[PDB]
From TrEMBL, chains A, B:
The gene is ozmQ. This is PKS. It comes from the Bacteria. GO terms for cellular component: cytoplasm; plasma membrane. The keyword Lipid metabolism applies. The chain holds residues 15 to 705 of 842 of the full protein. Keywords: Acyltransferase, Antibiotic biosynthesis, Fatty acid metabolism, Lipid metabolism, Multifunctional enzyme, Phosphopantetheine, Phosphoprotein, Transferase. GO terms for biological process: antibiotic biosynthetic process; DIM/DIP cell wall layer assembly; fatty acid biosynthetic process. Residues 3-432 form the Ketosynthase family 3 (KS3) domain. It comes from Streptomyces albus. GO terms for molecular function: 3-oxoacyl-[acyl-carrier-protein] synthase activity; fatty acid synthase activity; phosphopantetheine binding.
Length: 681, 681
């Protein structure tokens, strides 16, 4: 574990045909093109002019992001009017960043982590088209409100403000290479100590997606909507729509904290072509070759140890041979040719098109998934190599199969390239990640009942589909790594299968649900016989209980072993008092009601005075003792916490999970309400 | 000299009332407000509606950037149609960056330096207003051309492409704090080794500057166009227009290379407020306090050693007390209160208004000039302290005088703050810079005759006004640190006064001028007697001559001392041959013509064959020997180089200046042609 290695500890994406990493992996491993073909009816509905449809140069297809118009404004405390004004690219980036942090297992509203964010969005066609006329005929006040909801500057800071990211929050833009430049700056920030975690990401969404495009020979776009990277029939790409983000942390920190490591960034490099090329928009062999070599040098990774490269890969007749010539030059720099056919080459642009500002996210996230799965996937629309590409001069070949990624003398390593219009180039070196008994309280919360139900079904489903999940990790991730919201649910479970079923059934006997309407509860210290089996179980199983019980027995003047065996009022008091103090230590602020104190010793009376126990409440009461023939021990205590917490009591989950190693794991992400917010031009 | 210290080795600015650093220092030291008041006639000319003029809330004033519409497209190889399309913010940033590199003394078209650029521009109102209708009714091809000439992404890369910057070139945007964030990332890049030099800067230009504004109580803008920072009558600021850039290099490198150090950046910090504040646009004491403390810690600078702070300083009733409360908290963090009245506080927004994206450049450059001049300057419109500001809790007081900056126990140190809408905060620690015989060839070149004449007058003027300038440094800076352009001029001078006069007079006897029209010249090796005084002078004074003369004497079979004394044809040959070889070693590619070889020895014939001397030219001839009663020695040789170079011969000025330490110094910057490029809405 090198000092400079950066872990990818979470990620998220909404790309054409894939709203999550799991569905993206399905697109990739199944070798599918996500191109949408538009009917004439759909194009007419979209206001495409009739001469345009008739034109044989017009391409009736696109790479669309479904529900780009949807946004859960309520969750983010944003009004309808404001949601409508905000560029969909910024809305989608905000939800995507939320998802990435969720998958990482970190709730930035809690904890001491300092989280930065580097992000960029594409050309704001929402402002130009949908809000265009609105802008030029508006007051300075309303123009100002449109500026802070639409200018590029605000994508990173809106996210910082709404998610609570206190590290550097910077909008970074270099056109098609924006994604990997953001990744580069995030890593630089992390290594310099600006922050302890960082998001890096990008969004590109055309306000008029859903329409086709006119083919022009002087431009990068293909005549048929297909992107045939490295193929002899390569004729360009299709602009796509999408958004992606990764969460980054020093690898040593990630391992120490017990995070899931999806992959390791070994090094990154960024440069610019400068002047020495035939035009501002022209490609450059030398600029590309240099940034690849620079990234490998920084990563301390020899070119012969790289076994996959994710090319920028736009399928232009000029650009494809240049990209391979540049890779050959970089890879062969330390001598002569590497073994032919020894490094796979591919382009996700063949699946989802060219995501512009977000292209590098689609490329990096594909490569991360391949590495985590130790699985190579196809580059599509490849039938025969472009004769002008000099494959024989180097190690590259275009992989067209889903298959095991063969082991090598080093861990599996990949390169990821992204080259922008304007000549800023980026290359990132990524490595596969290093190799990796009682009941638990599972807690869920959402901003609406409907969201809570969906989240419950999602978790149930995820739990059924992976039995290998550790219930501990699931409980910890849910408690520590999810926003604390008003509609709440909880369940005490004995294992993953058990949990899956209980959550699916929704049977109130086990599944506790409460919301902001329900009354804040009190804990009731009752009379009743002792509970020796229950007392002994908590004493053995719960360290916090054991502490306060020992100290309570000291005050009462009786040995702990005596009280734990006892059936009398002193014993019943002790168990309940110790439970109440353990709850308090875990952050509970529920009042303790002790309504009947007659048959209690003076010491018990003082202890009740010390914690300021009320004599009554003016509020639902939760008993501190199990009912007869109810579950006892830790199962009871966890159910108690669950009942209080769902009803709005405070719990400090960090303190609650103190005594154990925490392991954060990927679980389903928030079911954002699909509310349409769209300004009509 | 700490490893992490960064030198500011050049800078440039066009702010209201100041098109250069020198004129900016005049605004600052003279305590002037650059606010422009608009007549009703001017406002009407600008298309301001009549109800608007009548409105008593309307403020008929602004902080305008003169000639924001002007751009030397020819110099940058840009067509008229393209120049018109490019956002004026990007045009102005491009010219400003050129100026900054010129003042630093580096021509990025030559040399091995790797230069990065981090820059941001403000809201593109040129695209929205001037090109708005044009965009929505244009083809996809023309929309694409408007995108690459107007989107934020392209400001840094356009500059990289047109100036030849091959380091990371990144557009960075965080609203009002953009400038110092760019500076922060440039320093991070430099310290990480992305590059060896870096530009950082920003431009903010409203397409409708020249109009007034309507006052709204819910906004940051003052009712009278004055910005009364920290005053009891503080009521906000005025939006301004401007552009600035700095050139950064590791301090150790700068000193080693002999650069001018204008100031030293000791440390920088960037953070974001996150969620814990009352609104997205609200201020935050804690965010500000943290970034100031973080910057000082990183700089290893104790708060008690800081004697000036350049505040964000926007003069809002809420914001001013908050900024001082935050500074107090940061400065007092290591104990109790520092001495009252011991650190000056000011805001350049009181001079030039709020330059938005460029505000931090105006603040940083003011602070750099103060430090270089060891002179404090006034913060304006300060009559009585705002009662709500807790000055007494800390060391701060508002300085209102131009006066010597008192020496202290450490070098003079300042802080510079910039806080953005969206909550990204930056603070930079700056320190004063460390303490610092023959003829010379001065070379000038421009892209037009008119520009060449203006540049000549400018240099003449600058030379008159500083006699302390070292002629050496002037010659080196001009030769190594200026773009090589087609209309050329040169002068051999014996000192600064001499140069100043010769350049002003323009007398062809001394001042050589030539352009692309003039013929590429040849050097002529003539017959004629020896020139013993001339030979001995070059031998003594020019190492390159001495080398080739020694070797030529070896070939001829005669001792060098004999030939240097000689009057014969062998001696005349030797001196001319050695001069020709010295020119070749300095990169000359002018043909050598030896038309009359009769009375030359065989050895001389072989030597002429070896360099492939022509027997004639089919071209003006320049003699390799001084004419009788002409200047001799180094003066002659330099005049020779000048004649060839002005006529288009190649010279490698790096090789030419090899044997000596180079010192780059500020000289006047390029006289960009004032051509208007402005799209009509
Ligand atoms: K070029
Ligand atoms: K808030």
């Amino acid at each position: 574990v090198r000092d400079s290695d950066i872990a990818v500890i979470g990620l998220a994406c909404r790309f054409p045909g894939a709203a999550t990493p799991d569905t993206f992996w399905k697109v990739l491993s199944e070798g599918r093109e996500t191109l949408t073909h538009f009917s004439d009816e759909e194009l007419r509905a979209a206001g495409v002019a009739e001469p345009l449809l008739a034109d044989d140069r017009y391409v009736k297809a696109g790479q669309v992001l479904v529900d780009a118009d949807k946004f859960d404004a309520g969750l983010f405390g944003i009004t309808r009017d404001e949601a409508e004004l905000i560029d969909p690219q910024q809305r989608q980036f905000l939800e995507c960043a939320y998802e990435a942090l969720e998958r990482a297992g970190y709730d930035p509203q809690r904890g001491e982590q300092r989280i930065g964010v580097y992000a960029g969005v594409g050309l704001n066609t929402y402002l130009l088209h949908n809000l265009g006329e609105r802008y030029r005929t508006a007051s300075s006040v309303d123009r100002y409100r449109m500026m802070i909801t639409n200018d590029k500057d605000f994508v990173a800071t809106r996210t910082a403000y709404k998610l609570n990211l206190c590290g550097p929050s910077v909008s970074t833009n270099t056109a098609c290479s924006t994604s990997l430049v953001a990744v580069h700056l995030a890593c630089l920030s992390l290594l310099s100590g600006d922050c302890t975690m960082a998001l890096a990401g990008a969004a590109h969404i055309q306000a008029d997606q859903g329409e086709g495009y006119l083919h022009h020979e002087g431009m990068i776009f293909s005549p048929d909507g297909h992107c045939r990277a490295f193929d002899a029939k390569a004729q360009g790409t299709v602009i796509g729509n999408g958004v992606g983000a990764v969460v980054l942390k020093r690898l040593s920190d990630a391992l120490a904290d017990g995070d899931t490591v999806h992959a390791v960034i070994k090094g990154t490099a960024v440069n610019n072509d400068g002047s020495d090329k035939t035009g501002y928009t022209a490609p450059s062999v030398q600029g590309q070759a240099a940034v690849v070599a620079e990234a490998q040098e920084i990563a301390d990774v020899g070119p012969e140890t790289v076994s996959y490269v994710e090319a920028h890969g736009t399928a232009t007749p000029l650009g494809d041979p240049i990209e391979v010539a540049a890779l050959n030059q970089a890879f062969n720099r330390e001598g002569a040719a590497l073994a032919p056919g020894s490094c796979a080459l591919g382009s996700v642009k063949t699946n989802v098109g060219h995501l512009d500002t977000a292209a590098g996210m689609a490329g990096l996230i594909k490569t991360i998934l391949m590495l985590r799965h130790r699985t190579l996937v196809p580059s599509l629309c490849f039938e025969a190599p472009n004769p002008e590409i000099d494959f024989a001069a180097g190690p590259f070949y275009v992989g067209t199969e889903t298959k095991e990624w063969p082991a090598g003398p080093t861990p599996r390593r990949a390169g990821v390239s992204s080259f922008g219009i304007g000549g800023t180039n980026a290359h990132v070196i990524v490595e596969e990640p290093p190799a990796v008994a009682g009941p638990r309280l599972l807690v869920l919360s959402a901003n609406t009942p409907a969201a809570l139900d969906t989240a419950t079904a999602d978790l149930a489903r995820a739990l059924r589909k992976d039995r290998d999940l550790d219930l501990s990790a699931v409980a910890q991730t849910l408690a520590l790594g999810r926003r604390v919201l008003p509609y709440r649910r909880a369940l005490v479970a004995t294992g993953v299968r058990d949990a899956a079923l209980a959550l699916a059934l929704g049977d109130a006997g086990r599944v506790m649900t409460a919301g902001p309407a329900d009354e804040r509860p009190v804990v009731e210290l009752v009379t009743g016989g002792g509970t020796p089996e229950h007392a002994a179980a908590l004493y053995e199983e719960a360290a916090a209980f054991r502490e306060h019980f020992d100290r309570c027995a000291a005050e009462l003047g009786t040995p702990a072993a005596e009280l734990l065996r006892g059936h009398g009022p002193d014993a019943a008091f002790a168990v309940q008092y110790a439970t109440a103090r353990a709850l308090a230590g875990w952050g509970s602020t529920a009042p303790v009601v002790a309504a009947d104190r007659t048959e209690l010793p003076d010491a018990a009376l003082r202890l009740l005075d010390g914690i300021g126990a009320q004599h009554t409440a003016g509020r639902p009461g939760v008993a501190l003792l199990p009912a007869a023939s109810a579950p006892v021990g830790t199962a009871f205590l966890l159910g108690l916490i669950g009942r209080l917490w769902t009803a709005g009591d405070t719990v400090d989950w960090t303190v609650f999970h103190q005594g154990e190693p925490v392991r954060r794991v990927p679980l389903p992400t928030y079911p954002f309400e699909r509310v349409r917010h769209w300004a009509e031009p």
